Amino acid sequence: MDVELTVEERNLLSVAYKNVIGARRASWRIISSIEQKEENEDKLKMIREYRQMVETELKLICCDILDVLDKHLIPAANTGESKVFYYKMKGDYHRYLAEFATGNDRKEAAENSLVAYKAASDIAMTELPPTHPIRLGLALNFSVFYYEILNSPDRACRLAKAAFDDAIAELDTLSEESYKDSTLIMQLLRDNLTLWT
């Protein structure tokens, strides 16, 4: 029940699946904006029928991806890089589940997201340099989880600033051909900080 992916294979699969999931997420946000405006007989119904139609698909994907993470990918992870990668993916997809879940489900997902993120963190801080793109993307998505889901701008800004400063510290001792990657995630973290503040 085990599968090992090269960095390229898992990167390409991640790009494909998150392209699909981002399409669905943006569609859901737009349908929600339409619902809110019309709410403020038959149209709204259909609108809801589309929103319920979106939410389902999204779920079916996210759930189906998390299964493959749990039943297959996460157990079969040797390198710490891949471990942090798969735990961040678990946290990200639980975050997407929480983004539209209602009731205690929104609670559920949220928990399973944090437990995932923390997990990756507990590896990253002891297995990956602060300059590593996996670790920086983990910190960025984790601070996003803090700000948008758990509604904690304080912890979010703390995590973002910590990651950015540790990166910018270890930056001087870093090859250019291995720092051009970290550049973009570091700048995204900086932009997110300037916005939140």
Binding site: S14, V15, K18, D92, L136, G137, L138, L140, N141, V144, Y147, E148, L184, I185, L188, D191, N192, L195, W196
Partner: peptide, 7 residues
């Protein structure tokens, strides 16, 4: 409303 990591 806030940027996550590119994928």
């Amino acid at each position: 409303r806030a940027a996550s990591s590119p994928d």
